[PDB]
Symmetry: C2
Subunit: 96 residues, 2 copies
């Protein structure tokens, strides 16, 4: 009845090569209290000049980016955030 | 192409009145590591005897339950839990 064209996530990330890091910057900047989808979108526009290229199932797309967390607030608002990546251990060779 | 029926979450919670309490229970017993959608479904079958009533976009439904968290792991695996 109603018809929707869904996005291929790889095509999105090829056409918009910076989208993951662009999202990470927006998330991390709101580390204290997190951020909703509407605010991710309008801030994406401010940083790129482009509309956020995902129109349906933004939650699923955002959760295809590693270390992205989402949570349902008590009021039912959906709050997104970025966790710190702890997996890589960094070696440092020191001289004299 | 591919047609589907959009699930009404009020209908679900009326046909399965204990579903929220059941998901939270499953999450409560997997607090230390979190749990994926596959394990939630098959754990739900174990506890209730019924198949999990939602089939597509379970993430969205799970995240309409207060206090439920979802994180994308480094592998891409999707982990669900409670804020605790």
């Amino acid at each position: 009845h109603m018809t929707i064209i869904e996005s291929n996530y790889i095509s999105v990330r090829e056409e918009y090569p910076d989208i993951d890091s662009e999202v990470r910057a927006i998330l991390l900047s709101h580390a204290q209290n997190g951020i909703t989808i509407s605010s991710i979108k309008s801030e994406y526009r401010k940083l790129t000049g482009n509309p956020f290229p995902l129109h349906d199932n933004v939650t699923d797309f955002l959760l295809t980016i590693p270390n992205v967390t989402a949570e349902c607030s008590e009021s039912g608002k959906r709050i997104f955030n970025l966790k710190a990546s702890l997996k890589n251990g960094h070696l440092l060779d020191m001289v004299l």
